[PDB]
Amino acid sequence: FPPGPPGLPFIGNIYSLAASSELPHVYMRKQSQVYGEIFSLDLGGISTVVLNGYDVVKECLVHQSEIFADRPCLPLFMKMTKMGGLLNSRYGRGWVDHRRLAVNSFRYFGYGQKSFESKILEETKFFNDAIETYKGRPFDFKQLITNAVSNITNLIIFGERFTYEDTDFQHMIELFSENVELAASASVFLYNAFPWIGILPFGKHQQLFRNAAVVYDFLSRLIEKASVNRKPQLPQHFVDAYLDEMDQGKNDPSSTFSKENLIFSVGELIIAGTETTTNVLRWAILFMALYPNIQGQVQKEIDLIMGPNGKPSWDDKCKMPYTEAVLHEVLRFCNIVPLGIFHATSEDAVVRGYSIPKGTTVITNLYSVHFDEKYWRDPEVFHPERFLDSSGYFAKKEALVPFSLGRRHCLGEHLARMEMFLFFTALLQRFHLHFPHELVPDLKPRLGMTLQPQPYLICAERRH
Ligand code: HEM
Numbered sequence: 001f002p003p004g005p006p007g008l009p010f011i012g013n014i015y016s017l018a019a020s021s022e023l024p025h026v027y028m029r030k031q032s033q034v035y036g037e038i039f040s041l042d043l044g045g046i047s048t049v050v051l052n053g054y055d056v057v058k059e060c061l062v063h064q065s066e067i068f069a070d071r072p073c074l075p076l077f078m079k080m081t082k083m084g085g086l087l088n089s090r091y092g093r094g095w096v097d098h099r100r101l102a103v104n105s106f107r108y109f110g111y112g113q114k115s116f117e118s119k120i121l122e123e124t125k126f127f128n129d130a131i132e133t134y135k136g137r138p139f140d141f142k143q144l145i146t147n148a149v150s151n152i153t154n155l156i157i158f159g160e161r162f163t164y165e166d167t168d169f170q171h172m173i174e175l176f177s178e179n180v181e182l183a184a185s186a187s188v189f190l191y192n193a194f195p196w197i198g199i200l201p202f203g204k205h206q207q208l209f210r211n212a213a214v215v216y217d218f219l220s221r222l223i224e225k226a227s228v229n230r231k232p233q234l235p236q237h238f239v240d241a242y243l244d245e246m247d248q249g250k251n252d253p254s255s256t257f258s259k260e261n262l263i264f265s266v267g268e269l270i271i272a273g274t275e276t277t278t279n280v281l282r283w284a285i286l287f288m289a290l291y292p293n294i295q296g297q298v299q300k301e302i303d304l305i306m307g308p309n310g311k312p313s314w315d316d317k318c319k320m321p322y323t324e325a326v327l328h329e330v331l332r333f334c335n336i337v338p339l340g341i342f343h344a345t346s347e348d349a350v351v352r353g354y355s356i357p358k359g360t361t362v363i364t365n366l367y368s369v370h371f372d373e374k375y376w377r378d379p380e381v382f383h384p385e386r387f388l389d390s391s392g393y394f395a396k397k398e399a400l401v402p403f404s405l406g407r408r409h410c411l412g413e414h415l416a417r418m419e420m421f422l423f424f425t426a427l428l429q430r431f432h433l434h435f436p437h438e439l440v441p442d443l444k445p446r447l448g449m450t451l452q453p454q455p456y457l458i459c460a461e462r463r464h
């Protein structure tokens with residue numbers, strides 16, 4: 001069983017993570033330098049194993065894919081979803097059924113259709129128009145980016161987009177997003193260690209359970225509004241398709257599709273899309289205002305390939321290596337999902353001599369892969385040029401894994417990439433981005449299951 005740093009009795013390394021000035025993924029990378037690529041932590045009595053660097057992360061999630069495909073049975077995840085749904089589903093027939101349905105649905109109701117790309121572009125127009133509203137005055141992009149990004153998924157799930165005046169839906173996403181953040185909280189690591197803490201009426205765990213209630217109700221209401229006009233066997237979207245599957249499993253009682261599992265799946269798909277993609281864009285914008293020379297080079301490429309008023313296109317990607325370079329270097333350098341989503345072993349495992357008992361939490365420290373000095377030159381530097389080959393084309397790197405690897409890898413990778421590219425290009429084509437009174441902006445990320453920047457104002461002035 002892998003060695004690791006010691007911590008106090010009862011609470012273990014929750015203390016050492018807690019009392020460290022460094023964020024958890026940074027903490028963990030330093031400890032691998034002392035204990036090895038694979039080390040352990042005692043998180044209040046839950047034994048967890050951390051994987052660090054590209055080699056062991058691959059060795060587990062890819063070479064032993066079925067053994068590390070599971071999710072851990074932490075009290076919070078048992079309470080929230082009973083380990084059904086998709087994202088936190090146990091590895092099994094339930095997960096196979098939901099994953100398959102989701103993959104096919106995103107293909108069929110999404111990027112598999114010729115008209116889909118223009119629906120993204122339609123959204124960049126609402127988005128850019130909303131930006132113009134402010135007439136170059138400083139504001140926070142967080143809301144608009146969130147609205148716009150979530151609508152690309154709303155099309156696939158609910159068959160429609162919600163307007164930017166829809167503050168009810170926005171409120172539901174703000175609570176759900178708070179929950180993704182509180183999930184990384186010391187309060188929650190303790191709650192999972194000591195679930196009797198649930199008797200305590202105050203604290204971040206009660207905020208999370210309350211939020212989850214409000215969110216669960218809202219999602220079931222949306223799912224009901226989206227199933228009104230349903231024509232059995234002729235689905236308009238993911239919700240209809242899910243209901244199709246419940247029909248075909250009415251006689252199969254071991255069928256895993258359920259009304260509860262539909263709310264969990266929809267919630268998981270919606271929050272997975274909105275949290276992550278939004279943040280990528282928010283980091284990118286931050287860095288383009290910080291480094292105008294880099295912003296300007298992207299803009300130069302846009303004008304050469306797309307012109308001043310051309311509609312951006314997914315097909316343009318491969319004529320725009322520098323743009324693709326910047327975007328990949330944001331994924332690598334900001335690590336929007338720094339520790340991925342926790343895994344667990346689906347059976348007793350043996351990795352590099354160490355034994356890992358069935359059910360152990362396994363943390364894949366994706367941050368440490370992107371800063372693995374065996375595969376990256378000076379990874380502590382933001383430098384898009386590292387993704388360019390000697391002819392100036394985009395050069396893909398094996399050790400860039402911001403959508404993780406193996407059986408559980410991001411289901412939305414492709415969709416995210418189109419969203420990112422089309423939103424970033426549409427925005428930079430129309431605007432110049434800089435800070436107010438050249439304010440000194442903060443680049444220290446906010447502690448959560450995803451990394452987002454602190455609130456920052458930005459000025460968007462039209463270019464032509
Ligand atoms: C920049 C955008 C995104 C990033 C960086 C990202 C990252 C990730 C990561 C690191 C995982 C962990 C997989 C694991 O357990 O090892 C994941 C899983 C997942 N992602 Fe994404 N994601 C993004 C966008 C999306 C979008 C747009 C969707 C859906 C529309 C999505 C849906 C999911 C789902 C459902 C899972 C769980 C898959 C499973 O458990 O089988 N993600 N994502």
Ligand SMILES: C=C1CC[C@H](O)C/C1=C\C=C1\CCC[C@]2(C)[C@@H]([C@H](C)CCCC(C)C)CC[C@@H]12
Nearest residue numbers: 080179183212213215216264267268272275449
């Ligand atoms: C769906 C439903 C159904 C609706 C309920 O309110 C609860 C719920 C999800 C709850 C959570 C809270 C805990 C943290 C979870 C389990 C997130 C998980 C830690 C992954 C977050 C990282 C991801 C955005 C990359 C995803 C869903 C989150």
